[PDB]
Symmetry: D2
Subunit: 266 residues, 4 copies
């Protein structure tokens, strides 16, 4: 049964690009990919982080390829993509792990600032997808996986309209699946729930009487799983989405939330 499990879930002989994965969530997702036989490629805006990245991967026994590129840089990404496509080879899997916009109150930011985020920052994951599609098509099999922002992510300002950008993960997932599914590309999403991170570690701090932090207690009650998400919880689900096992799954958002959205359906 080793061969069966390998046939369906293995990522052997496949190049996987996971944007931003020099730490945190993208990182532990790439970690899981590597451990399933994938070749890891990732990026970040500045060199120091990339290095910290590779070091961190190495300590786990992973040879990662790390580049310096802004995901929002149009020409930059394309260069990074075909540069990967020689140094490392054809990208089989793209994990869009994009977000965390410069948090400037929508009334403080100038027209210049809007023009930027609307035209560039929000189109990032589309740019990166567009950059890697021609290859995947050539080779006859692609996996593009879009990771929605986790429900843990604090400080996000709700902007309903931004869901209508051509970038923007729920939209993008569905259009790429529709337009490019027939060239054997599967585009899907991960919807992470309340994933514990050091950022939200205060919201778990035990009280002076040793009772649970109020918010921590809310999350536990309202999550049927009765516990926070851990980054590791997204690992396997993401392989599944990157492996032959999900080849007839397209345009679907997989929610890794301990069933909280389902509790919101009673």
């Amino acid at each position: 049964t080793e061969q069966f499990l390998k046939d369906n879930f293995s990522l052997e002989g496949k190049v996987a690009l996971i944007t931003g994965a020099s730490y945190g969530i993208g990182f532990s997702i790439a970690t899981a990919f590597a451990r399933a036989g994938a070749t890891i490629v990732f990026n970040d805006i500045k060199q120091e982080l990339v290095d910290k990245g590779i070091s961190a991967y190495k300590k786990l026994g992973i040879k990662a390829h790390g580049y310096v590129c802004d995901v929002t840089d149009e020409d930059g990404i394309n260069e990074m993509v075909d540069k990967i496509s020689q140094d490392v080879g054809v990208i089989d899997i793209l994990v869009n792990n994009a977000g965390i916009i410069k948090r400037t109150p929508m009334l403080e930011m100038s027209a210049a600032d809007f023009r930027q985020v609307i035209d560039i920052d929000l189109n990032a994951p589309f740019i990166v997808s567009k950059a890697v599609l021609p290859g995947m098509i050539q080779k006859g099999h692609g996996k593009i996986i879009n990771i929605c922002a986790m429900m843990s992510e604090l400080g996000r300002e709700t902007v309903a309209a931004y869901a209508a950008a051509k970038g923007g993960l729920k939209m993008l997932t569905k259009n790429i699946a529709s337009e490019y599914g027939s060239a054997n590309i599967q585009c899907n999403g991960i919807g992470p729930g309340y994933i514990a991170t050091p950022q939200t570690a205060p919201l778990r701090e035990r009280q002076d009487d040793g009772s649970r932090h109020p918010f921590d207690q809310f999350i536990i009650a309202k999550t049927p799983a009765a516990r926070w998400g851990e980054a590791e919880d997204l690992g396997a689900p993401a392989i599944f989405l990157a492996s032959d096992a999900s080849n007839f799954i397209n345009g679907h958002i997989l929610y890794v939330d301990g069933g909280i959205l389902a509790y919101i359906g009673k």
Copy 2:
């Protein structure tokens, strides 16, 4: 055909409580109600606003009943409710127009602050509903209308978990409809789109070359209606929800958005 239009859409001889409606959106919704024959009752946390309220209604030729109550005040609301029920009579229609929480970054606020918002602030619309149900049931017909925050509302911090409170409009709408529909109560919601307010008037400011503000231009492109919402757009829809015309409609969210959510469905 005057009698027909009156039979289905009139709000004559019906008491309507619209929380917070001393200005802005709740105000223009109450304005429309009055003009359809309703009796207006509203509240606010402090007296000066209530007065400004009544003045504003009067100038339009509307006698409004204005009380001073915090929507979040448990005992306060109940008092306000039966006090209305003698001075003005049985509340037929409740318009929950609740939101705009003290915008303190979720990492700055203490456990005390969370304990408050989780247990009190988020349960407000449930408290106010609970306070007015026994009457509506007695009389044999209720309308509770929950107004989701408009897509125009800036500074809202996304907190997926808060949708699971028993207050919280999408949840509350569905439970009240389910539990109390058989006592002839119809609970539904309005989902306002990008409604122009003086707050977001900067986002409409014409540029130095006389071209459209970038964000303003986004909203127009992505809204099939090709224009922002105006408060007046919610008036009639809300009567409809408060009138005999919607008596076999329950647990439904009516979106007044110029079809932007539908564009997000391509």
Copy 3:
């Protein structure tokens, strides 16, 4: 307050085409329209029905214009449309009330039969919409209302794929709203619940012991409204959708179901 109620909800000086409305549901919807000041136009495949139609309308004190056309007839509908546009004038409101396909088991029907239903029968409401859009646009205001099949409709065979036709109400609603909302056309739907009809009157028959029919009892328990829908329940909601009151509502499915879909959300 007569003028207010008229301004928002009246259908005066507006031509309304309601396909099939020579009896039943479309009929009582047209009945309500007329009573709100609309001019009624309707059709059917054969003359005898049309006549029965007009007679039925007349007895209620309504002058209806009745034509003979197959909704599926491409060239036929266009003729019927501009023929209406002279004899009666510009169609302001289109109510697509389309469905009830020849119930032949999907394995009994030949390729000829499929070719027909896929290419013609399912595109009907799109054909009729397409036929009336140029006028509505000219005049600067349209209402196209698509009436989903009621949950009462027995014998419907589930064919998930048919939702992907360009006809087909949920799809059509969203595309027309998106493409033509900016020419001030509002396209929306009614989703009728369990509407009592003489067809399903057996499912309400009291038992020999005077207890409720099992199915009748199911519907009452699972509908929060605790009763079946009546055709009349769709009347006002449909005006609302046809009146100035819903002008900033587009691409939305209004469910008139006594809150059963909401009970299915607990």
Copy 4:
């Protein structure tokens, strides 16, 4: 990387009950489970089928345990369950593969017939779930997987109300996930698309000119994947749902549809 792939996706030392899986879909799902190290248990209403079952499994090199039970038989299932729990041991995984009701037109069937389907036939998957929960809880880990009827399944009569039964997969999935997620049970669903079966093989028959059957051609156009589903496509997805890899996934419907639902979202 064999140990990693085994840790997350293996079904070793786990008992899997897949109702009805003596042929067809449940069968190929069990086939895949076995090949991932699971122990297969299945049932059917009559002995001959069970035998045909075991034979079919054996030829593939699988020792299956086959019982005779009606899924709808209340007392019968419980017996079958604890009987399995000694002869085979604790059921770790339940795959509800329930449906295909006696297709009698809803107007032909008596109150007796309704009383049956409403109270018994529709509660089946709930009965079987209820029967296997106490064990899974004891052992500290359960997987209950509900397989929605495939979009391929012809002759299904649409009965919106039946979604409100406590059996009934979309409802059941969400309630079990909510109530029992905190005892470490993960309940989820598979939503199969247009899965090719010998039943619908006529709908794929090439025409006398060698062109594609009209319906076959529709499915290919409207499915972004551009091809029908095969039973094998549900195999891995179902393991994923049965394995440690999906432990923080609860109350979720996984659609294995080649992205057709997503095309219905444009």
